[PDB]
Ligand binder design. Structure first.
Ligand SMILES: *[C@@H]1O[C@H](CO[C@H]2O[C@@H](C)[C@@H](O)[C@@H](O)[C@@H]2O)[C@@H](O[C@@H]2O[C@H](CO)[C@@H](O)[C@H](O)[C@H]2NC(C)=O)[C@H](O)[C@H]1NC(C)=O
Ligand SMILES: *[C@@H]1O[C@H](CO)[C@@H](O)[C@H](O)[C@H]1NC(C)=O
Lengths: 8, 274, 99
């Protein structure tokens, strides 16, 4: 399952 | 042997044409198993491998919600970078990310990674220690500082060592008939004339799985790896792979050269001649 | 960065007239991502082609596959037409069944 990415 | 779980994510802006396109594709080893594409009528995470039919509706609902969240976060990211790089809102730009984990034959973690790129160039990435970041330019350095204050490395590491590893094992178990199989390559050689009394010999390897393979041409027991021409191993549309390698030999001595194919589905490597 | 795509056309099985097969058009090593890929049969666009296997390499260039089921005949010809910013003109690669 996928990740929830952090803003740049 | 070892196995991997990887996600390739990309967001591309298109000024004057609406919102950026967002796509996320997941792979177990070298085969696609899930995907989300924002340009679909009603965007949803969808199965791309037959064995994914084993997950219930809750899986699809949760992955979809996370994907829609990522879509919005990357949209904002595109705007943020215009600021870091002092670029205009009129041009198209691209953010790319590769995330994943690999385990050995025993299911234990071998390595984890997460790397970003902006317009085709390295931006920021997690180091092998899974604790610190490396930034390619001063803009990425701003991102590095934000991520350090937010405790991002710890969250990501928890995902790579935990969630990623556990679900990869589950996928390997559910899709064992597909993922743990071996399809032996079928090979043949083609011949093509050329000017100056020379000939092109091409060795083909077809219908194999997994993707790793080695094709070489030999002369007098030596390896002509220096003169060979070839293509990167490629998908054939049904879950199997294909590849070819060629060499130019003088007309008349084709019998002197041989093609060798090494693959896990070949107890003893194949040897072919025209 | 800008990289021109490499376009490769091939079938799953060695072509035999009257026997079901699969035709592939693998487009690789390109950047930017915007691209248009069409598969053609006797100069006409093939409907419902499947797009799959999108990924990137270590240098970030894009890869993607277009494929469709088909049954070759002695007369039918096939090709793959691609439009990308790295090229002023669209590029068409023809299936060479004797390759
Ligand atoms: C792939 O693994 C299955 C075993 O796994 C089955 O049960 C769960 C683990 C679940 O993942 C489910 O999807 C999967 O089908 C093998 O089947 C088993 O084979 C043994 C042989 O000793 C039988 O005794 C079991 O009854 C049988 N389980 C089933 C399906 O009832 C299967 O052989 C294997 N495939 C191959 C060839 O690698
Ligand atoms: C940003 O770009 C403009 C021109 O587009 C230039 O005038 C300005 O000096 C730049 N600002 C920075 C960040 O140096």
């Amino acid at each position: 399952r996928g990740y929830v990415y952090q803003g740049l | 042997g070892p196995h991997s779980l990887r996600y390739f994510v990309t967001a591309v802006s298109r000024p004057g044409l609406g919102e950026p396109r967002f796509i996320s594709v997941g792979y177990v080893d070298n085969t696609e198993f899930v995907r989300f594409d924002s340009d679909a009528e009603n965007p949803r995470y969808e199965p791309r491998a037959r064995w994914m039919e084993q997950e219930g509706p809750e899986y699809w609902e949760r992955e979809t919600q996370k994907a829609k969240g990522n879509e919005q976060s990357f949209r904002v990211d595109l705007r943020t970078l215009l600021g870091y790089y002092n670029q205009s809102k009129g041009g198209s730009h691209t953010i790319q990310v590769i995330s994943g984990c690999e385990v050995g034959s025993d299911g234990r973690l071998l390595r984890g990674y997460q790397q970003y790129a902006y317009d085709g160039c390295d931006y920021i990435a997690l180091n092998e220690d899974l604790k610190t970041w490396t930034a390619a330019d001063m803009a990425a350095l701003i991102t590095k500082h934000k991520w350090e204050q937010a405790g991002e490395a710890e969250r990501l590491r928890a995902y790579l060592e935990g969630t990623c590893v556990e679900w990869l094992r589950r996928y390997l178990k559910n899709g064992n008939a597909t993922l743990l199989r071996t399809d032996s390559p079928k090979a043949h050689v083609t011949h093509h004339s050329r000017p100056e009394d020379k000939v092109t010999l091409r060795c083909w390897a077809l219908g194999f799985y997994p993707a790793d393979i080695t094709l070489t041409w030999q002369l007098n027991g030596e390896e002509l790896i220096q003169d060979m021409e070839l293509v990167e191993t490629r998908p054939a549309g049904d879950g199997t792979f294909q590849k070819w390698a060629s060499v130019v030999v003088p007309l008349g001595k084709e019998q002197y050269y041989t093609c060798h194919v090494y693959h896990q589905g070949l107890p003893e490597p194949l040897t072919l001649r025209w | 960065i800008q990289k021109t795509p490499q376009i490769q056309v091939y079938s799953r099985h060695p072509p035999e007239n009257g026997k079901p097969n699969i035709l592939n058009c693998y487009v690789t090593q390109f950047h930017p991502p915007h691209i248009e890929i069409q598969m053609l049969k006797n100069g006409k666009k093939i409907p419902k082609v499947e797009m799959s296997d999108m990924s990137f390499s270590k240098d970030w260039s894009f890869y993607i596959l277009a494929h469709t089921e088909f049954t070759p005949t002695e007369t039918d010809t096939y090709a793959c037409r691609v439009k990308h910013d790295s090229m002023a003109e669209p590029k068409t690669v023809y299936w060479d069944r004797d390759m």
